[PDB]
Amino acid sequence: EDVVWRWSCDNGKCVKLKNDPRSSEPALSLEACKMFCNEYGLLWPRPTGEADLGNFLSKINLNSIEVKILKKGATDDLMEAAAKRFKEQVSLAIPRGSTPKLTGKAVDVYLVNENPNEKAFSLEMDESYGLRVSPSGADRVNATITANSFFGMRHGLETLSQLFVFDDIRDHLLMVRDVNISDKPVYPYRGILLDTARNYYSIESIKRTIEAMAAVKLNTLHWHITDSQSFPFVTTKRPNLYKFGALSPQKVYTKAAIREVVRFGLERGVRVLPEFDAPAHVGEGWQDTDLTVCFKAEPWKSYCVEPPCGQLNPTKDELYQYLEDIYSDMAEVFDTTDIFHMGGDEVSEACWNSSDSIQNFMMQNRWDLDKESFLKLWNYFQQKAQDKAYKAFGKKLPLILWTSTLTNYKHIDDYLNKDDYIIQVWTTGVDPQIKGLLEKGYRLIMSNYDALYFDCGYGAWVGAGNNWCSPYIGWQKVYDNSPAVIALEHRDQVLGGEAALWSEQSDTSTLDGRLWPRAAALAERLWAEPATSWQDAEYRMLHIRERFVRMGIQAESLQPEWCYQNEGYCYS
Ligand SMILES: COc1ccc2cc3[n+](cc2c1OCCC[n+]1cccc2ccccc21)CCc1cc2c(cc1-3)OCO2
Ligand SMILES: *[C@@H]1O[C@H](CO)[C@@H](O)[C@H](O)[C@H]1NC(C)=O
Ligand SMILES: *[C@@H]1O[C@H](CO)[C@@H](O)[C@H](O)[C@H]1NC(C)=O
């Protein structure tokens, strides 16, 4: 039936009041009130530069929006696809089952791509844009997006679509009348790590994830595509790896499917970054090669962090022929990435020390069997693996490794160097390793497990209780986790951050709820690095959750919808 309430801005809060008929004041719908009661309206993330939204809305004819590309170039196909997606972006303002009256002004969207040939991902790419909205004549709106590249331009299309509101009191589609926005991200690497080896994720759910990432301007999908539990990556050159390693014949990622995901990501400004974790985190798929040790070793607690155990045997020269083929097959289909993630997760010495051939190998080279020697074996592996990666990608390119024994800042320079290796950080923001790494010039990606491990909090998956990194991390905590605070003067060496969805307790069915809307908190933290805390983003965070749901994302619920309609009454 008919909406009964209206909202009125009062000290930054939209107050619900009855829509009394005996009033000469025009009623405000909830989101129309929110657009101007809130400092940044309904925007997420909030812009970093100019953020002038004016004071008025204009009624818009949904069928009279037209996008015009003013500069043509190599990104013509990308710009056209982004333009065609803009109307459905706009329709996200309308609740499902509601239809706007097809009246109001016409909208002209002018896209100005000032370097229309640029379309490569790089840490130095220009994601900035300018957004202007103003009345054009009497019956039209002029929205002009100006950006130095396609990626900044499609960010601006995202922000523009957030400047529409549905008046459900009147069934009118509205748009902010006078807008001056300039915007650019604080960090170039704004990512989500998706583990698709501890459990399988449908390609459809991966594309859905990329959709939601683009909606909040995240730009990197780190595809943790192999691990001990499964090998779903279809490597044409070593087919037994996925044939033996896959959980099932249908639970694989073919070349065609990965190409689909990579293209889907490029069109939305998302770099699809593959990882082959090595030399630990291997197992399924390597049967009958004699290239691993400790696979399914028992008791697993004595040999690895979680079952099944298993590590590569770096003393077998055939291993690096396998690795070169894997990396080459990855480079063929992951052909938008400028970076390669090589894992580097903590190696088990007990696993390597229990091997006949490994100990004989270490005798012959004057190595003992102490802790320092197995670190030397790990360095031996990473050097040879790194060479195959360069040959596979046909060029030197940045490589990522996790913080580990190998990348301890006290000895990381022994074989790594800060120009070839980026370090992904799981330690807490107060761990001394971060300061030690930054002073040695290393670049960092923050994935602090106390704020950015999105798998924490659920039940145990071995034994009873809860999983290892519980409690569950609320969005308030991931919002307040600031890399700038963590890095201090070395801020420029922080490339950004990444929410990690490890998947021993997550798959296709839980993907939406694990990531959303919590990854939006990381999106604003990395895009804007606000000096304000989560309380000042709370109202806009509640709205972006609703926008995710309108997109079809099964996003987690944060608060009673009553709180969303009654700002200021839910606090502590
Ligand atoms: C790549 O980083 C990773 C990735 C995966 C990790 C997985 C597990 N564990 C640390 C991990 C880690 O390191 C995170 C640092 C953990 N950690 C360091 C220092 C102090 C701590 C105090 C309290 C809790 C954890 C503290 C901890 C044991 C553990 C037991 C399990 C399990 C998983 C883990 O599944 C079945 O049983
Ligand atoms: C649209 O607005 C932009 C920014 O103010 C302006 O540069 C451009 O000339 C306008 N175009 C039209 C057709 O009004
Ligand atoms: C490796 O095993 C040998 C016995 O085979 C033992 O002497 C040595 O201390 C072990 N080293 C480590 C690091 O466990």
PDB file of N, CA, C and O and ligand atoms in Angstrom, residues 349-350 352-354 359 368-374, ligand 3:
ATOM      1  N   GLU A 349      59.557 -27.455   9.137  1.00  0.00           N
ATOM      2  CA  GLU A 349      60.846 -28.134   9.089  1.00  0.00           C
ATOM      3  C   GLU A 349      60.697 -29.611   9.436  1.00  0.00           C
ATOM      4  O   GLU A 349      61.381 -30.464   8.863  1.00  0.00           O
ATOM      5  N   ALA A 350      59.829 -29.927  10.396  1.00  0.00           N
ATOM      6  CA  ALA A 350      59.561 -31.321  10.742  1.00  0.00           C
ATOM      7  C   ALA A 350      59.137 -32.118   9.516  1.00  0.00           C
ATOM      8  O   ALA A 350      59.511 -33.286   9.368  1.00  0.00           O
ATOM      9  N   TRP A 352      60.007 -31.366   6.262  1.00  0.00           N
ATOM     10  CA  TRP A 352      61.165 -31.516   5.386  1.00  0.00           C
ATOM     11  C   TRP A 352      62.229 -32.418   5.998  1.00  0.00           C
ATOM     12  O   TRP A 352      62.931 -33.125   5.267  1.00  0.00           O
ATOM     13  N   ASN A 353      62.363 -32.416   7.328  1.00  0.00           N
ATOM     14  CA  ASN A 353      63.412 -33.193   7.981  1.00  0.00           C
ATOM     15  C   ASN A 353      63.113 -34.685   8.019  1.00  0.00           C
ATOM     16  O   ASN A 353      64.030 -35.478   8.261  1.00  0.00           O
ATOM     17  N   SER A 354      61.863 -35.083   7.798  1.00  0.00           N
ATOM     18  CA  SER A 354      61.475 -36.487   7.814  1.00  0.00           C
ATOM     19  C   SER A 354      61.650 -37.163   6.461  1.00  0.00           C
ATOM     20  O   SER A 354      61.195 -38.297   6.285  1.00  0.00           O
ATOM     21  N   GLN A 359      67.304 -34.978   3.406  1.00  0.00           N
ATOM     22  CA  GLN A 359      68.447 -34.985   4.312  1.00  0.00           C
ATOM     23  C   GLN A 359      69.736 -35.332   3.579  1.00  0.00           C
ATOM     24  O   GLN A 359      70.777 -34.710   3.820  1.00  0.00           O
ATOM     25  N   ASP A 368      73.938 -28.645   7.646  1.00  0.00           N
ATOM     26  CA  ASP A 368      73.493 -29.421   8.797  1.00  0.00           C
ATOM     27  C   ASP A 368      71.983 -29.617   8.691  1.00  0.00           C
ATOM     28  O   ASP A 368      71.359 -29.291   7.675  1.00  0.00           O
ATOM     29  N   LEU A 369      71.377 -30.120   9.758  1.00  0.00           N
ATOM     30  CA  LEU A 369      69.932 -30.297   9.835  1.00  0.00           C
ATOM     31  C   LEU A 369      69.335 -29.434  10.942  1.00  0.00           C
ATOM     32  O   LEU A 369      68.377 -29.824  11.614  1.00  0.00           O
ATOM     33  N   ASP A 370      69.895 -28.245  11.134  1.00  0.00           N
ATOM     34  CA  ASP A 370      69.390 -27.310  12.124  1.00  0.00           C
ATOM     35  C   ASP A 370      68.333 -26.396  11.508  1.00  0.00           C
ATOM     36  O   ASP A 370      68.058 -26.436  10.306  1.00  0.00           O
ATOM     37  N   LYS A 371      67.741 -25.560  12.363  1.00  0.00           N
ATOM     38  CA  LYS A 371      66.701 -24.640  11.915  1.00  0.00           C
ATOM     39  C   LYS A 371      67.207 -23.721  10.810  1.00  0.00           C
ATOM     40  O   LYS A 371      66.491 -23.456   9.836  1.00  0.00           O
ATOM     41  N   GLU A 372      68.438 -23.222  10.944  1.00  0.00           N
ATOM     42  CA  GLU A 372      68.973 -22.292   9.956  1.00  0.00           C
ATOM     43  C   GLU A 372      69.130 -22.941   8.584  1.00  0.00           C
ATOM     44  O   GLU A 372      68.977 -22.260   7.564  1.00  0.00           O
ATOM     45  N   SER A 373      69.413 -24.249   8.542  1.00  0.00           N
ATOM     46  CA  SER A 373      69.628 -24.936   7.269  1.00  0.00           C
ATOM     47  C   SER A 373      68.367 -25.110   6.462  1.00  0.00           C
ATOM     48  O   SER A 373      68.427 -25.154   5.229  1.00  0.00           O
ATOM     49  N   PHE A 374      67.255 -25.356   7.134  1.00  0.00           N
ATOM     50  CA  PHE A 374      66.012 -25.507   6.410  1.00  0.00           C
ATOM     51  C   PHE A 374      65.539 -24.169   5.878  1.00  0.00           C
ATOM     52  O   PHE A 374      64.932 -24.113   4.804  1.00  0.00           O
TER      53      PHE A 374
HETATM   54  C1  LIG B   3      66.315 -33.621  11.909  1.00  0.00           C
HETATM   55  O1  LIG B   3      66.384 -35.023  12.201  1.00  0.00           O
HETATM   56  C2  LIG B   3      67.650 -35.442  12.738  1.00  0.00           C
HETATM   57  C3  LIG B   3      67.570 -36.939  12.928  1.00  0.00           C
HETATM   58  O2  LIG B   3      67.197 -37.602  11.728  1.00  0.00           O
HETATM   59  C4  LIG B   3      67.949 -34.693  14.035  1.00  0.00           C
HETATM   60  O3  LIG B   3      69.253 -35.046  14.482  1.00  0.00           O
HETATM   61  C5  LIG B   3      67.866 -33.188  13.816  1.00  0.00           C
HETATM   62  O4  LIG B   3      68.013 -32.501  15.054  1.00  0.00           O
HETATM   63  C6  LIG B   3      66.527 -32.821  13.187  1.00  0.00           C
HETATM   64  N1  LIG B   3      66.452 -31.392  12.934  1.00  0.00           N
HETATM   65  C7  LIG B   3      65.357 -30.667  13.182  1.00  0.00           C
HETATM   66  C8  LIG B   3      65.448 -29.205  12.865  1.00  0.00           C
HETATM   67  O5  LIG B   3      64.336 -31.171  13.642  1.00  0.00           O
END
